[PDB]
């Protein structure tokens, strides 16, 4: 599958401007300067960059390069546990599969970041893992230009809970969870509206949908994942903060890394939202939505 080479390819635009050219053999002054410039130019942001230079300078008395990688990877792991295991030497070839904490995943994000396409790729990912998957077409206030989630469901043989344009999205989500439960489904992906400037406040609508999910199943949704487009950069972060404050994210999916030189944005994303990156979109293929691996990510940022 060339998992690792696919990621390197997806991060090529980001890496080939400055990162891979850093003169790791010169005197400190030069190499530190080039490193800071490369990090800033990749959208790592000043805060995170300044911290790296501090962690690698005074501290980090192993190989400079090795130090850098270690700090970048550390910034990308919100979970202390997995970070500990990593330090203990835990480094499997294939990144362990992402397992949703519960049966329902509420998918959120602004209109156009790729929520529909992402859910389709997730449906495939989880079907291949043997899960029985269901979709709920929550964005019922629009005819999502292009391929509707309903059409993707037919292509993948995944049932799609849906209603006429304008249907109460909370009521739809409740029906989907009941159907998921009644029909013995392992996972339900609830798509949601993404337009921030309509007659219906978006955050209020999402909170209503989440409430409805919980009403049908008191423990759900155990995952709330925000989809963010890498191309957008640090812009999709202020908004991300609002989604987090309204519905409580448990994870982030970053798409279209291959279309920007700003792939370092995943660092500020994790430091700001303090939730894990679940998958990364490295291309537009069905298997181009890869489960995130901090170590592999950082290696691809700086190598090849």
Author numbering: 1 to 304
From the reporting publication:
The functional core proteins of the signal recognition particle (SRP) and the SRP receptor (SR) (called Ffh and FtsY in bacteria) contain GTPase domains and form a distinct subfamily of GTPases. These GTPases mediate cotranslational targeting of secretory and membrane proteins to the endoplasmic reticulum (ER) membrane in eukaryotes or the plasma membrane in prokaryotes. SRP GTPases are unique in that activation of GTP-hydrolysis occurs upon formation of a complex of two GTPases. Here we report the structures of two conformations of FtsY in complex with the substrate analogue GMPPNP.
